[PDB]
């Protein structure tokens, strides 16, 4: 299903071309701007371990997930991936641990060396 599709077909959006962050655009967005470092960004998301065994969503809190891009408030893979997204876009990301929580992990939610999958909808972004 979705994570395997991203393995198979996604674009490697890493600078190092190490396949650490793979992307598919699932729904195309509007306009020419993409976020840049410093922007306040608003998303809805659905995440899970690519194994499938935990499944976290902004909708579980009935409100958008808000963060400042490139301020290390989210994992490196979000700073990289959301920077590529247009407003209204829905994208699938598949993320190696190097761009997420690494060999240390983040227990109890995230084990060591975890690959992560997200669907992200970019709702809006505003310049600091
Ligand atoms: C490692 O801890 C969590 C990881 C994740 C969600 C968490 C975590 O809290 C213990 O709580 C969800 C409550 C809302 N929320 C999200 C954040 N802050 N509050 C950003 C997090 C502090 C860091 O999260 C991230 O960088 C990414 C991207 C933004 C959305 C949440 N992220 C996660 O890694 C999720 C994770 C997704 C895979 C399945 C388990 C939860």
Query: Quick one: biggest sheet?
Result: 7 strands, antiparallel
Radius of gyration from the CA trace?
A: 14 Å
- Give the H and E element order: HEEEEEHEE
Tally of discrete structural domains: 1
The helix tally amounts to 2
Give me the secondary-structure category. mainly beta
Helical amount: 10-25%
Instruction: Name the beta content range.
Output: 25-35%
PDB class: isomerase
Keywords: fkbp, safit, isomerase
Assembly: monomeric
Entry title: The FK1 domain of FKBP51 in complex with the macrocyclic SAFit analog 12f/j
3D structure, described in words:
- The PDB classes it as isomerase.
- The entry lists the keywords fkbp, Inhibitor, safit, Macrocycle, Complex, isomerase.
- It forms a monomeric assembly.
- With 128 residues, the chain is mostly beta strands.
- The chain has one domain (1-128).
- The chain contains two helices and seven strands.
- The protein has helices at residues 2-9, 76-83, and strands at 11-12, 21-27, 40-49, 55-57, 65-68, 90-95, 116-126.
- Strands 1, 2, 3, 4, 5, 6 and 7 form a seven-stranded antiparallel β-sheet that branches.
- The protein starts with a helix and ends with a strand.
- Bound molecules: ligand A1INW.
- Ligand A1INW is lined by residues 45, 47-49, 54, 56, 65, 74-75, 78, 106, 109-110, 116.
Secondary-structure blueprint:
Blueprint: H1 2-9, E1 11-12, E2 21-27, E3 40-49, E4 55-57, E5 65-68, H2 76-83, E6 90-95, E7 116-126
Antiparallel strand pairs: 1-2, 2-6, 3-4, 3-5, 3-7, 6-7
Ligand A1INW binds at residues 45, 47-49, 54, 56, 65, 74-75, 78, 106, 109-110, 116.
Protein name: Peptidyl-prolyl cis-trans isomerase FKBP5
Modified residues (N6-acetyllysine): 16
Subcellular location: Cytoplasm; Nucleus
């Amino acid at each position: 299903g979705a994570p395997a599709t991203v393995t198979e077909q996604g674009e490697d959006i890493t600078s190092k071309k190490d396949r650490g962050v793979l992307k598919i655009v699932k729904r195309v967005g509007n306009g020419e701007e993409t976020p840049m470092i410093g922007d306040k960004v608003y998303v809805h998301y659905k995440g899970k371990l690519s194994n499938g065994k935990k499944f976290d969503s902004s909708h579980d809190r009935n409100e958008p997930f808000v963060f400042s891009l490139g301020k290390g408030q989210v994992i490196k893979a979000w700073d990289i991936g959301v920077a590529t997204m247009k407003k209204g876009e829905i994208a699938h990301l598949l993320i190696k641990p190097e761009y997420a929580y690494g060999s240390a992990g983040s227990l109890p939610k995230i084990p060591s060396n975890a690959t992560l999958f997200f669907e992200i909808e970019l709702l809006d972004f505003k310049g600091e």
